[PDB]
Design a protein around this ligand. Structure first.
Ligand SMILES: C[C@H](Nc1ccc2ncc(CO)cc2c1)C(=O)Nc1ccc(Cl)c(N(C)C)c1
Ligand SMILES: C[C@H](Nc1ccc2ncc(CO)cc2c1)C(=O)Nc1ccc(Cl)c(N(C)C)c1
Ligand SMILES: C[C@H](Nc1ccc2ncc(CO)cc2c1)C(=O)Nc1ccc(Cl)c(N(C)C)c1
Ligand SMILES: C[C@H](Nc1ccc2ncc(CO)cc2c1)C(=O)Nc1ccc(Cl)c(N(C)C)c1
Ligand SMILES: C[C@H](Nc1ccc2ncc(CO)cc2c1)C(=O)Nc1ccc(Cl)c(N(C)C)c1
Ligand SMILES: O=c1[nH]cnc2c1ncn2[C@@H]1O[C@H](COP(=O)(O)O)[C@@H](O)[C@H]1O
Ligand SMILES: O=c1[nH]cnc2c1ncn2[C@@H]1O[C@H](COP(=O)(O)O)[C@@H](O)[C@H]1O
Ligand SMILES: O=c1[nH]cnc2c1ncn2[C@@H]1O[C@H](COP(=O)(O)O)[C@@H](O)[C@H]1O
Ligand SMILES: O=c1[nH]cnc2c1ncn2[C@@H]1O[C@H](COP(=O)(O)O)[C@@H](O)[C@H]1O
Ligand SMILES: O=c1[nH]cnc2c1ncn2[C@@H]1O[C@H](COP(=O)(O)O)[C@@H](O)[C@H]1O
Lengths: 336, 336, 337, 337, 338
């Protein structure tokens, strides 16, 4: 009677996209989309700001495949600015490359809300960073809203992203602060334990829908966490996402940080949450594990974009915006 | 909210047929039905157009038991036309046999939308094929709609089927194109990975219902994919299907293509999706595996038809059309 | 849309009974109920008409504990009438015993719709059977409806049950035929494969509710099949059942037919569906053949199952079976609950 | 010490045959061998005398492929003699490797016990044209078996006689002395066998064959009965001293084997049970009752087994069965190997 | 090398009995044997002195089938003597194979320790009419057991005495010189036993029986105590040199065994625990586990299945009497593959 149930929230496995009239072949579809209101990517993939996913090596390949990588903040201001420079000064000895006005590969960097943030932001913009990601566990906070407002007023020459959020109210708050894009994701990550530890969360399909409906395409959103297959990406874009941030899928690849480990005859790479005991050294909100060796990241990216191309062919979507505006879904049961 | 949820789509496991007043015994029911608006079968079974399910041997046996087999297109025009001739020229040394006006066993053949289709269609009709199946992964496309219209206009002496579809709008499109029957099924196949790779699909009970409700019995529909038991067949017919296409159930049988393999003391036969890496040599949308040796196909067909007879006895359906028009269902939970 | 979905049907695991104001202790509740409009039992338990559950030995113990056993029809007319006689002529060398007007232990017998049915029915009534169970897989048939009408017209001195059913329309049909009780159950049995083979069924809580709502307490119903625990029995009675038929729970007990088998150090007894390949030896099987572990004397299982139903009546404030039947309140639970 | 350990007995998995100098290709080897001192087979395979393995159908297919079937005794004298006649009167509607008698009729064997109906059974089988009488019990080193084989040889010298089951050299000499034309070796190795657990009796098959063969000194052949899972076991058995191999498990589940195909959980199976199981007897049971997967025509399985044996003879440099029997060299392997 | 490896010790699963020439059918064999030098049983079966196996009910049933029951010591002197009286005063309201004394009363045995209450316990049990006193500890080759056995024989010559538990020939000779009428063999083979893990002490049962039997030279019989899972183990034990077999696990879970039936996860069970478990003791570290065995129903069924299997074994070896199997059995050693 007094319990407030806002809605029955839906995840990726709760829905399926419906096929519609199509005259487009998967090989002919355009994967071009917008990361912010000022930055466009050639593929809707964004590599996760994590110490086991993105560093300079991963950020180069992402951009080289038409996407973008967000360097993690679990490194000192000097280390992060040095990683930005490595991506910006990289020269090929890739026609679908994601580059700036000066023909340099695009890169992003993650920042907190704390005391070293003004020095961190200044050093990253100076190093030539394209986008600043003001990212915490709870983006619907004065700390994130006001830190986003600070970066837009003091550094208008750089694009700013606010995260993480899962409601329409949070999106309007960050829109008013001057965010160029919002990062959507509260509890969906594969290594995430936020739901068990805090009982806080919002299944990703309803999270994207809530944010996208409030924004009214004024700024794009990044669907962050919980992508296991190429089908999830199509559902995310269909629900309202402009891009998709992945961690698990890019972890274990050659380009990801960490050396290959030989455990029980097989090859693995470490994969851990940024809120895990190992990543922090608050009660932990993430796990530490090992993912199998996937080889060059290019293979995984091609296989994922291949699946999204087929989905766009099934929905009759020639461009990303066609899938975003015309997608029709069906709700499925546990049997389906 | 901006998210468009058309309906809560239902699969076979989501529903159960209700028993109704009955004066008919299972051994007395008529399994006679229509494959197309010109072809009638003695049983509602159709063998899948797959390189591990239907070739000349399987088509003969399907036709001998009162069903029909669709010859696969993973062979050259000359091989496919020779397979049509093998079934049409077959002479028994079977009172329920499915035969044409000339007393020859009935056969069907699958065609694509590619460049070799006019030469393939012409050679199959010349070889005496009863039905042409214009089938792709996405039948709600200009490619399938216009090819179905081409076959009907250029070869009116042959029956044409369009597939695969899962919506009422797709059915009306193929109906207006001149299809004699529609093939329903987007994502329910046992070897299918369309749902994981593309995030596209429609649970089979809701797919059949949507198609059947739009058609208004103007042309029949084949419920294609996802049949595991004889109960699924009864649910499919009750939902609106006239015939049922099966791959998994007929794979592993003596008549199915492929030699028996002796693995770990047991006997198996290969079973693979037509969108698998092995079948194509687009990102794969099917798996490759082994099914246990089932022996002569006749046994499996009799067990399946036996179960459908019991269901018609429970519903008080003397004829297939009684189950199609009078069936009443209940929705069941994950506990049921 | 043209698809006809009558309702979202519920099973035992879909619901939970709510506790209500209570002044009654579980040890003080009355388990007395009615099998038919003429037969009353001291406990709501009925043993299944199965060749691995009820024969003379099981019907005696069920009647001794307050219940009733239904003898199976997978035996000739002479064998079945002899089994009726064994129960009726049994003398103790049990205060809650279910007995007739002549002080003899009560017994039931299953009959089909086939050609031997008039000879079978006549021989069972002559042997002193209390209730005739006209039992097939599909009781909403002319075969069952007309046979129940034949038994009532030709043998009014005996009580008649019709089954199996799962809808209100089927219940009204058997009520108009003169059935004294209806047996509810289409697809909930533990050994049943009707749902996989025919795609036919009705989850038991919705089946009981549909039948009970149509009947309006004119004749009782036997909730037949799908009982795994004592909680299911309380849910069944709360949904509208007057009695409960069990097979799996009484299988494996000392009293059940079959000799104990020593497999891999443990002790088991056979348990099979009446539509299995082995039980039938035409129709495709609709039941499985298996082994249940040895449970020892049936008395232990009956006491545990009646103990659980007593606690439930204590939780609902139900002093008598009719209090649970008329006052029970439920909540629907998800797959998480 | 008082404990008498005769030897460390070896099974199939304890040994491996060594490859030796070879000039023979597997396709060129001769699989011809002797079943008895008077009967020769074209392949060293025998189908077990079991109610789920050999009846007339299996015996015809066995004979057609160059082997022989031993019809089971779990049927009356009239039915068993009718099964012998069915094999002897069989005419092809082509099998060049067919095992046939002097009159060009397919060869067949029949199992007999030591019971009271044995003289009537033996007389009726010889009259029906049986080629070999198998006096087979669980314990062939008994007065019952020894004297019955001696009775068959003295009263019916026109027929070949086999004695079994045995596992020692002393048992072989006893049966050789009574006039057996061949001995059957196997105490405890059967796949469905529980003799080892129930009686604590047994002898691993490689040591059982070796013990029997060493005592006989090729005077009469021996049949390696039980425990064959793969084509490699057959080569090890022949190398150890066997002239033929009896199989039950491998031929069970085939089209030709007795029993109808059963559809359990989507798959196809056939029954397979020990002759000392509760079901086969209706002594404490010494065998289990189970289901084997449907293998289709027996011909496929036989070709796979004879193919594997051909490769083995190619590896050993064995042109004829007798070359493998006399020249095979083995190595003992550990639990790691 | 300085490490002393006495032998490669063998268990039940390491050996198989060989079939030999036979003229006697399993239904015709004699299962009669001797428990002590003065007591004979009609079947070679003894129920274990455990609080979840043998109380008066199990002992009555054991004797009625021709065996004997050893009453446990995890009860006061008055209760144990009352259990002896219950078996001795039992009268049938038919069991032709019953194991009875000179006065036609069902035979019974009782377990005693080496503790301070032992003289009062022994005196009260003999007074109650006990047939055999079992001086049983975890280690029978101790001054405590040897001297207590010697005390019982000297002070109560009218009663039979058993000494246990032992696993060597030296131990057997020590108890033989003490005046034991029979020895109980079993160090570490118990199903609920953890002696091997806790102390690293043990001797596989086939070699334990062989070592004891070879030293004794049939002067006194031995009871194969512990590690019997099937009827085949019993035949191997007798063939190795045992006159009787003590079983705990096989008789636990039966109707006659102490404890009420428990309904866990739809099934019926009875408790079964080691006498050296935490629960049985309530300052030695535990040497046994506490568990549940499935409900087996009347003990008669289990006993008939075991004696049936042993009958077949004697019919395979050509053993008309127990002594034929004991003296003529031939074995083969098998590998992990066999
Ligand atoms: C330890 C935990 N770790 C992380 C780390 C990275 C994360 N990244 C994303 C998400 C979204 O599920 C959660 C995350 C939690 C974490 O930051 N908790 C956490 C919980 C509640 C609040 Cl209000 C805050 N504010 C930002 C101070 C932080
Ligand atoms: C590789 C995959 N393979 C298959 C093959 C056979 C199938 N057969 C049936 C179904 C039913 O979902 C799917 C199938 C997918 C496939 O064809 N994908 C696919 C995906 C989207 C589009 Cl728009 C198209 N159009 C026909 C060009 C094809
Ligand atoms: C083979 C099966 N076997 C059984 C046997 C006993 C049963 N007893 C109860 C139930 C309740 O689901 C089903 C049963 C099925 C069975 O009777 N099928 C069956 C199916 C449909 C109809 Cl219309 C009929 N009519 C009565 C002739 C019979
Ligand atoms: C019940 C058992 N069943 C079988 C049946 C077939 C067998 N066939 C082969 C083997 C060899 O392991 C054992 C078998 C046991 C069986 O015959 N026991 C059995 C045990 C010992 C003896 Cl002395 C005898 N004599 C012949 C009377 C019989
Ligand atoms: C706790 C343990 N419990 C038991 C109880 C009964 C047993 N019964 C048999 C066996 C055979 O290993 C071991 C047993 C251990 C036990 O008594 N240990 C134990 C260990 C070493 C010694 Cl020298 C002694 N002496 C008698 C004082 C006792
Ligand atoms: O420890 C953590 N707790 C919760 N979420 C985390 C943690 N570390 C990273 N994340 C989020 O999870 C995403 C990775 O999601 P995934 O692709 O499902 O592995 C990241 O991009 C973050 O938004
Ligand atoms: O690779 C594939 N991907 C998806 N669906 C497939 C593929 N190959 C065949 N199918 C469909 O799956 C059906 C077989 O369904 P099944 O009876 O559930 O095995 C075929 O008749 C096709 O409609
Ligand atoms: O083979 C069969 N198929 C379907 N239902 C069966 C079969 N045999 C018995 N039944 C039903 O299942 C009940 C037993 O239900 P249980 O208590 O869940 O084991 C019986 O009382 C019958 O109503
Ligand atoms: O119940 C039984 N107990 C023990 N051995 C058996 C039984 N029935 C048959 N056998 C033997 O086991 C053989 C079959 O061995 P398999 O090829 O390993 O299955 C038969 O030829 C018999 O010698
Ligand atoms: O806790 C214990 N530790 C070790 N052995 C025990 C314990 N309790 C009883 N035993 C022995 O184990 C035997 C039971 O053996 P079982 O038949 O294999 O269960 C008893 O007769 C004792 O000799």
């Amino acid at each position: 009677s007094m319990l407030t149930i806002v809605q029955e929230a839906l995840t990726f496995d709760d829905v399926l996209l419906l096929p519609a009239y199509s005259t487009v072949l998967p090989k002919d579809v355009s994967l071009k989309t917008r990361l912010t209101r000022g930055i466009y990517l050639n593929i809707p993939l964004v590599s996760a700001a994590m110490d086991t996913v993105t560093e300079s090596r991963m950020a180069i390949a992402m951009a080289q495949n038409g996407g973008i990588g967000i360097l993690h903040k679990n490194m000192d201001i000097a280390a992060q600015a040095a990683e930005v420079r490595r991506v910006k000064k990289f020269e090929a000895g890739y026609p679908n490359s994601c580059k700036d006005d000066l023909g340099r590969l695009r890169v992003g960097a993650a920042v907190g809300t704390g005391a070293d943030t003004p020095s961190r932001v200044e050093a990253l913009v100076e190093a030539g960073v394209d986008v600043i990601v003001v990212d915490t566990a709870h983006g619907h906070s004065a700390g994130v809203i006001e830190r986003v407002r600070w970066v837009k007023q003091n550094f208008p020459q750089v694009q700013v992203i606010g995260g993480n959020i899962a409601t329409g109210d949070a999106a309007l708050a960050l829109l008013d602060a001057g965010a160029d894009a919002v990062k959507v994701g509260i509890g969906p990550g594969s290594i995430c334990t936020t739901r068990i530890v805090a009982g806080i969360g919002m299944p990703q399909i309803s999270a994207i829908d809530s944010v996208a409906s409030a924004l009214k395409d004024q700024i794009p959103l990044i669907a962050d966490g919980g992508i296991r297959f190429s089908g999830d990406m199509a559902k995310a874009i269909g629900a309202g996402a402009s891009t998709i941030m992945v961690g698990s899928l890019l972890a274990g690849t050659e380009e990801a940080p960490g050396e290959v480990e030989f455990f029980q005859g097989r090859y693995y790479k470490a994969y851990r949450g940024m809120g895990s005991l190992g990543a922090m050294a608050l009660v932990p909100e993430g796990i530490e594990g090992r993912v199998p060796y996937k080889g060059p990241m290019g293979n995984i990216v091609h296989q994922m974009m291949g699946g999204l191309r087929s989905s766009m062919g099934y929905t009759g979507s020639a461009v990303i915006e066609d899938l975003r505006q015309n997608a029709k879904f069906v709700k499925i049961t546990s049997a389906g």
